[PDB]
């Protein structure tokens, strides 16, 4: 348990035409952390009032 | 009469750098339908309450 399924790597695209005097850098990433079943975890917590 | 005048048959364009992560497809055609003289057609009409 605790796998991080990954659709793709990080990518970079760039755009400057038909812009106005300006290179633009765009980056994207699709990643998520999602566990299977609810077992084997704690917080703690650890609290005041 | 009822000639089909045209100056641009169908053009299919394509952009992807970058659109902000979104391709764009553009389709255009330049055409018209026009008659030399005001005669040669009737419409019914076929109308009542």
- Structural tokens at position B27: 């389709």
A26:B17 CB<8 A: no
Q: Nearest C-alpha of chain B: how many angstroms from A9? A: 15
- Give how far the C-alpha of residue B34 lies from the chain's centroid of Cα atoms, to the nearest Å: 12
Q: Is B18 left (phi over 0), alpha (psi -120 to 50) or beta?
A: alpha
DSSP B4: -
- Structural tokens at position A44: 């703690």
Cβ atoms of A3 and A34 closer than 8 Å:
yes
């Amino acid at each position: 348990n605790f796998v991080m399924p990954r659709q793709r790597a990080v990518t970079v695209e760039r755009e400057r035409q038909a812009g106005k005097q300006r290179d633009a850098y765009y980056v994207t990433q699709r990643v998520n952390l999602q566990r299977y079943f609810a077992n084997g975890v704690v917080s703690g917590t650890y609290a005041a009032s």
